[PDB]
Structures are given as C-alpha cells and as structure tokens.
Amino acid sequence: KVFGRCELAAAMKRHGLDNYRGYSLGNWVCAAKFESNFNTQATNRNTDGSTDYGILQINSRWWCNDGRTPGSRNLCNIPCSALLSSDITASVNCAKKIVSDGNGMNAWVAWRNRCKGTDVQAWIRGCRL
C-alpha cells in the first residue's frame, strides 16, 4: 500500500508516535517519505548484504529475520515479511524499540540526512488537528 501523507500521519498518531521520546509526529512522517516513499511493501538491499523492509525500512541484521542475513538478532521477534503489510502495528512496535536503542532517530540515515535540522511540521501541515 502507498499511504497518503495524511493517512499515514493519522495512523502513526493512533499508535502513539507523536512526541514519542520527544520526536514530533512530523519527524516520523518525514522518515517514512524518504525511507520508503510511503509504501508498506518497500524492500531494499544495503551493501553490508542486509535488507531494509517496509514503511521505515527496518533492517535485518538486528531487527527481524529474513533468513539471509548472517548473524541476525531478530531483536522484534519478527519475520522481516510481516513488516510489508498494510497494518503498520509491527513496524511501529519495532520502530519504538529502535528509537529507544540510545542513538534515537539518527538510527535512520534518511532521517539524519534529510529530516533532521528541518521544519518537520510541513509534514503534517493540512492534517486533520
């Protein structure tokens, strides 16, 4: 599914991401544009050989098991495939655990490289609040 911008803003608020560990809702919406272009089915290869999955692009080396990444820890006890669904619960439960891993949202290179230091409110401007 390719979520509409305000549709995704609405969903992440439902699960309690607005201001989670101090990161305003718009930082998450901003992360989800640039990681995946708003698409729950997104999958990408990293060099280290790991793959990034879904809306936020959760990585298989630590975070979910995909069976092809040596040394995977499956720190969300989850199949990476389940994070491509249309129901973003698993991707949020896991994202809550990553962000809480100390380096915050800097765990997302597109957040660092593109969201951070910006007016992350443009990402929810027009959302019915």
From 13, 41, 46, 104, residue interacting with Cl ion (rule: CB under 5 A): 104
Among Na ion, Cl ion, none, the one that 104 touches (CB under a kind-dependent 5 to 8 A) is: Cl ion
Residue 84 or 94: the one with the smaller Cβ distance to Cl ion is 94
State the nearest-atom distance from the C-beta of 65 to Na ion, in Å: 5
34 near 114, Cβ under 8 Å?
Answer: yes
73 DSSP 8-state letter: -
In Å, what is the CA distance from 90 to each residue of 85, 87, 102, 112, 115? 9, 8, 20, 23, 23
Q: Which ranges constitute the DSSP H helices of 3-120?
A: 5-14, 25-36, 89-99, 109-112
Residue 84 or 107: the one with the smaller Cβ distance to Cl ion is 107
101 annotated as ligand-binding: yes
Chain positions contacting Na ion, by CB under 5 A: 60, 72-74
Catalytic sites, residue numbers: 35, 52
State the nearest-atom distance from the C-beta of 128 to Na ion, in Å: 37
71 near 80, Cβ under 8 Å?
Answer: no
Binding-site residue numbers for substrate are 101
